[PDB]
């Protein structure tokens, strides 16, 4: 099959021969930054950086090479209702307007896991790092933090909520009335979250060694980076609620609004065909086939299939203004497009 | 994990969808990137960049 010349990350692109080639390259770069479920046993692993989406979805418009990439078993992204419109001017210059009500309903919400490792080493008789809860008069150099989060072992427990000025591991090293000095570790500055797991073991040298996983729930913000599967990356410009978004005659508001000016210079026509095929697949119940070199699938066939479901054949719909209720004069191209939340949060 | 079924991999808290192909060095997963090179034992004739040699063989 001639579509077997593509790699792993370029085989998830729907209709990649309808895009300009640098945008296929850019999506292949950004398919590795897309957040989904990276592996199934993510609860055991103490990965130093992990991102898990709450509700990853398989694409409505897939390629036949995606069956062997196991993308429908570990997906990275959500099928958004994307309307390509100029609404309020907050999606200009590669920017995205998301639905605040959708985001409240769990749209693209994720968790981010940090892991902190610490060894209870013994460097001779004089230097002896010990996992213990530091005491204000015994320990020198205590960082004016809340050390009451820790337990009697010097380690925090899972479930305790923490921030950048909080200690998670209490480690004190003997000083050769200050019998020891505090060499504890804290969270990174501007980080936050809740301690998810605390694991204690022995390392190769036989000393006590702990790994603490802290989760932080990442709700999609203004400035978070979202990319379609066609090299159309952009940050969230603003979030409007469901009553502020434009709506169809049946009340469907877009989850994402992107600018019409992101298409013509980039020539990502496969994005538009993916929206059309996603509309047909959602109204039909099928999963759209977007294998690159397929003569059984062209734009006119998808248009006739869409017109069979009581829609305009080119994917346009009459949207009404969310603010005033008036019909928008230009009918808006709206449909399901597979979007990806990238790791580059603000 | 060689030849183990999905249930046996899940008993070991291992992902059946994990393809392997990496090493665990000090608890860190290391992947070996395939380094490409000129093929050995083959005669290649090039034209050097305006040096004292107009053409050069190489094996």
């Amino acid at each position: 099959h001639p579509s077997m010349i593509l790699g792993v990350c370029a085989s998830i692109i729907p209709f990649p021969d309808h895009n300009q080639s640098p945008r296929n390259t850019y999506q292949s770069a950004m398919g590795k930054q897309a957040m989904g479920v990276y592996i199934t046993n993510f609860h055991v692993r103490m990965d130093t950086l992990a991102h898990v989406l709450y509700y990853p979805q398989k694409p409505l418009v897939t390629t036949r090479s995606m069956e062997y990439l196991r993308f429908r078993e570990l997906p990275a992204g959500i099928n958004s209702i994307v309307a390509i419109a100029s609404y309020t001017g907050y999606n200009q210059e590669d920017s995205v307007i998301m639905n605040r009500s959708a985001v409240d309903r769990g749209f693209f919400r994720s968790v981010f896991y940090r892991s902190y490792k610490e060894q209870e080493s013994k460097k001779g008789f004089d230097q002896e790092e010990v996992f213990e809860k530091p005491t204000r008069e015994t320990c020198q150099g205590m960082r004016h933090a809340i050390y009451d989060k820790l337990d009697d072992d010097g380690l925090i427990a899972p479930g305790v909520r923490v921030s950048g000025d909080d200690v998670i591991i209490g480690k004190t090293v003997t000083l050769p009335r200050y019998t020891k000095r505090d060499c504890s570790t804290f969270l990174r500055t501007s980080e936050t979250g809740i301690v998810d797991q605390v694991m204690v073991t022995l390392n190769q040298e036989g000393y006590k060694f702990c790994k603490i996983r802290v989760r932080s729930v990442r709700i999609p913000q203004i400035g978070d980076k979202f990319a379609s599967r066609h090299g159309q990356k952009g940050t969230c410009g603003i979030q409007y609620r469901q009553e502020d978004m434009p709506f169809t005659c049946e009340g469907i508001t877009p989850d994402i609004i992107i600018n019409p000016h992101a298409i013509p210079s980039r020539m990502t026509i496969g994005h538009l065909i993916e929206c059309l095929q996603g509309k047909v697949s959602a109204n039909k119940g099928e999963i759209g086939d977007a294998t690159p070199f397929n003569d059984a699938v062209n734009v006119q066939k998808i248009s006739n299939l869409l017109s069979d479901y009581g829609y305009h054949l080119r994917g346009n719909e009459v949207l009404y203004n969310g603010f005033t209720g008036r019909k928008i004069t230009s009918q808006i191209f709206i449909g399901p497009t597979y979007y990806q939340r990238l790791k580059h949060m603000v | 994990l060689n030849g183990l079924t999905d249930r046996d991999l899940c008993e070991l808290n291992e992902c059946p969808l994990d393809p392997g192909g990496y090493f665990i060095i000090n608890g860190s997963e290391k992947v070996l990137i395939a380094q490409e090179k000129m093929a050995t034992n083959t005669v290649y004739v090039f034209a050097k960049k305006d040096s004292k040699y107009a053409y050069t063989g190489e094996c």
Binding site: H1, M4, V8, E67, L69, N294 | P19, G20, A34
Partner: peptide, 29 residues
Amino acid sequence: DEITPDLWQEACWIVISSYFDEKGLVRQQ
């Protein structure tokens, strides 16, 4: 006899599947 063109598109993606059942994706490692 041979594979008809109308039966071809579902046939090739069968044999490709038989590849990835056997080799997988990290076979070269």
